[model samples]
Target: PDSVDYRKKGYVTPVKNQGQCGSSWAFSSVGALEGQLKKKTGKLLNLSPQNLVDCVSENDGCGGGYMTNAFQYVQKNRGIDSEDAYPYVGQEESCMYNPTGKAAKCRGYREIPEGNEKALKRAVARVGPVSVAIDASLTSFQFYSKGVYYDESCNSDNLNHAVLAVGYGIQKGNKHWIIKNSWGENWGNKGYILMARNKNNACGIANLASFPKM
Candidate 1:
């Protein structure tokens, strides 16, 4: 068996230009939902980060967002839209009408555990994907980036957005967390990063909305 048997369940095809758009939060939220939907129906769908950008009112769209808030939007709203319904403008815009209301509310997702990596491992092993957030040092991530990247500028109070922890495993004796990023594949090891799993690990981010099946 693979060291990491299961990845975060649902993932939409990675979106592009999130850097220019400040839409990382949208990508993480929608990506996890897309993976969960796929795990449930076996149908891969390209969801709209723009919809979340347009609809999610709680936080900044491109800059960042809270995973819990995004999940709540989806849970109460049921499901979000494909990029076709709401396109990515790549910058902060005004909220619009969401016919599906999927972006308005969240459900069908859960948390791994508080201050627990093995708990995260167990949950991800069972569910599909989990939404997480890391320090801004994670934003500067490059290569198979290792060790800790913590930015005092990140301001512990205002981590704006969320992301997905798709898979977990070890590389070269370092416990690493595999994450899917909104940035294009051309950036940061094809839109993925390996972060050290240590106490108060910044890159572990937040884990939210997991679909364990498939």
Candidate 2:
């Protein structure tokens, strides 16, 4: 398949910080929706992660959550407001959802087959952005700065954090996926990561890949 770069296409939004909270799931969901909305409308909208963190019952605000449930909340709740309407506070707070003022909506979501790298690649290439869970507890990943990340210690079956897969490309002779992280721009390659692709689902990247349908 041909290489794809959603960031260069204006579908991917700028890097966002999840703060000290474990709100990576919320950020990942928002990032996926933002890319999808941009692809459909030709305009990038800074959707609200705080809205999902506070409003989505399936998620524990700032503690942790699932991207699938986040999308479900958006679908049932009609839509989500923009960051300007409901800015992220990092910590847990009460839901202040305003149904009358929403910035983006999600019709549904689709999941790629677990451990299927090719399927995940196709999703990132044809679709907008994909939300995925990974074992991000590794010291290397937490302090990652640049270069293709590949740690044998990172288990594919032990995912604890969520991020967005924005694109894919080849580095040297190895294929990799370009991931947008929730940690701030200073963390890794401007808050982005290049994970080992087509390597038997390294880092559990292909284990839980899904994207929102805007």
Candidate 3:
């Protein structure tokens, strides 16, 4: 295929906000899980990021966490609750995960090869939305408004933010990936960002890509 957009395919969910918490990791994991949950079960339901924040002892809760660890938690825990079952608070809260014992479940997770944008694109187009780490410390990212983002100065070795790559396409001859953000609809382009792709993994978008298995 020449391009893909999971958002249009209905695998992507509405953009969410992480607020002051460093739980972009949690949101990223949930973002991937939500897609897989639907791709298999045909239910576009929202999963609980708060479930990862409160439970998942191996993680740092709202302070910080990783998508792989979060997926592992879901695998061991048998499944994740829904937004109505364990809603997100935008902050750390006590564990209240009473397993709905429901449809959205994780059996495992897979990682994209390091620095491989092609692999990332394949995963996004065929597997599902992918959770990825990127160098979001750059000020341009903080105030990103529109257009394909291709910052040459963006660091590839230092990734500080976690997000989801839902799709890929060419806009005005500029290749980019449709990335879902957790900074709310007010940030980025309606809670999403068009990131530079096939540009040596700009911002390290493919450096740490992975998605949960449903």
Candidate 4:
């Protein structure tokens, strides 16, 4: 019934590019992690998505992965590096484990109930930006621009891509979930998209949502 934009609250960073790598999941994980850190420390730091891309041993690097797996990897590995020190190369490479320059560490993470957009909003408002799984295979999704994106053809059960839910708002009465993408700013509305929110869990946006615990 209202709006809450976390971007203005400094929980969101600039849009990034994943390049040729299928590491959107890594980006998604970092998105939520960055928010958690900024919200607590009062400082915005760019964590490395490449850290998850290369070091998350259980998950496939560059090929694909999940945000929760990345979170687990961070929890197991002690901490993650900053983007300035461990910038993303967008390709799978040898793991360069470094104990120094640790930017953030994950204690654990919490998962929202599947198909519960209300639960997702609760987390975003009370915690920070949330890592969410969604169906991003549609051509429309790939070429989304300004305005709330809503398509009845979107799939729910078959989530293929990972994204960040930065906030939610109503665009002239059409409620939408603000999504932060990793495909660069040219890809969407400044590297973001607003999907039809509370619309039968459109495109599985609420299917596999989770947020890191600092």
Candidate 5:
């Protein structure tokens, strides 16, 4: 069986756990933008979250950050490449763009805030991508090994990590959304997952924005 190209089908990526890295902002930001770009150009551009991690100095290194903050980082800076350029180190390190370095950074960047999520989605649907934050400390997600895990406890402000909401719509009278993740391919729905519509406000996903583009 051939795996489907969800992006081509307008499916969003999964919500990836940046684990211990504050770079969740970068991952979510870039991941969302990637989907937007793909939707716009019909081309999948694998960007580098590691570059944002190394370059964006505003966000606390690997501790945590906002999607808007990371978008601003990418905006001020020209942008970043794929892991092939600057691989993920899974931790904070001094800013460095060395191809050999585990991570890389851009120069300067800022984000565009559209306020409400509908506006944000329109902007992202037009611009390229957007980054989002969600509380994923739910019991279902705590030990999520596979399949869809939904828990009301996901509604909280504690576990703030970034994710990319590429697209959304209604299915069988049920609202569902697609997200992109950074977890290894072996984890969680083959590196992607879905959330119920309006579920935990997408676990706080409504808080989405994009970088200004350096």
Candidate 6:
């Protein structure tokens, strides 16, 4: 395929801020769920990351978490509520997810094969926004602005930060993966980053890719 951009099709929600908390995991999971809900119901719901932070017991609240655990919690608990109901406070709190206030539900989720960029692309194009983990500790990634980001220091073995793969495209004849981060709009390209694609898992973009199914 040539290229794909889910944001143009209205699948992506606006950039969210995770603040000083280590809650990128919840943001990534919520981002994918929001996109999947938009794809299935034609409504873009701002699902709560705080719900995962508070309710999901499989993963730690704000300290850290896994998108897979969030998905499992959503699937097991029937569904998750919206940001309007629970809201984000960038801190860990007691579980407060109410069944009557649910705004979105995930039936399941699946992980793309490790180191398979093509599979990740197919999932993003056909399914919706996919959750991914990357080694974002590098100085270049922390201050990434314009252009495709590809740092040799970032490897798949040390993936620690979670983000959402919103889309993919060709920039100056180079394939790039569109990543949505939870660090506010002023951080990257309006709260997003274009990462190099088809480059042997650059920044571990393909190592831990997955999406929620509605």
Candidate 1 lDDT over 1-214, as tens digits, reads 3346233333446545576766677777776776667666676666777777777788677666765566666556556767776777788777664675332224445666655677776666666666676554434554434443333344334344456677777776666677777767775666666655544545345333333222
What are the per-residue Cα lDDT tens digits for candidate 3 across 1-214?
Answer: 5898888888988888888889999999999999998889787788889889998888897778789999999999888898878888888888777866344788999999999998888888788899999999989888999999988899999988999989899888899999999998999899988998888889999888999988
lDDT of 5 at 159: 45
Q: Give the TM-score of candidate 2.
A: 0.97
The C-alpha TM-scores of every prediction are 0.76, 0.97, 0.97, 0.97, 0.70, 0.97
Global lDDT for candidate 3?
A: 0.88
lDDT of 4 at 184: 92
Which regions of candidate 4 fall more than 4 Å away from where they truly are? none
CA lDDT for candidate 6? 0.90
Q: What lDDT score belongs to each candidate, Candidate 1 first?
A: 0.60, 0.90, 0.88, 0.90, 0.57, 0.90
Q: How many clashing residue pairs appear in each of the predictions shown?
A: 36, 0, 0, 0, 22, 0
Better candidate number, 2 or 4, judged by lDDT: 4
In the range 1-214, model 5's lDDT, one tens digit per residue, is 2112345565344344566665767777667655654555565555666676767777776776666666555555545566566667787766766444322233333444423556554554555445656676666764566444456666545546566655555545555555566665565666655656555454655654453332
Segments in model 6 whose C-alpha atoms lie over 4 Å from true places: none
Q: After superposition, how far is residue 156 of candidate 1 from its true place, in Å?
A: 7.9
For model 3, what is the alpha-carbon lDDT of residue 105? 83
Q: Specify the poorest-scoring 10-residue window by lDDT in model 2.
A: 92-101
C-alpha-based local distance difference test score of model 4: 0.90
Where model 3 places Cα greater than 4 Å from the true spot, the runs are: 101-103
Clashing pairs in 2: none
lDDT of 2 at 1: 54
When summed lDDT is taken over every stretch of 10 residues in candidate 3, the lowest stretch is 95-104
Q: Residue 129 in candidate 2 has what lDDT?
A: 86
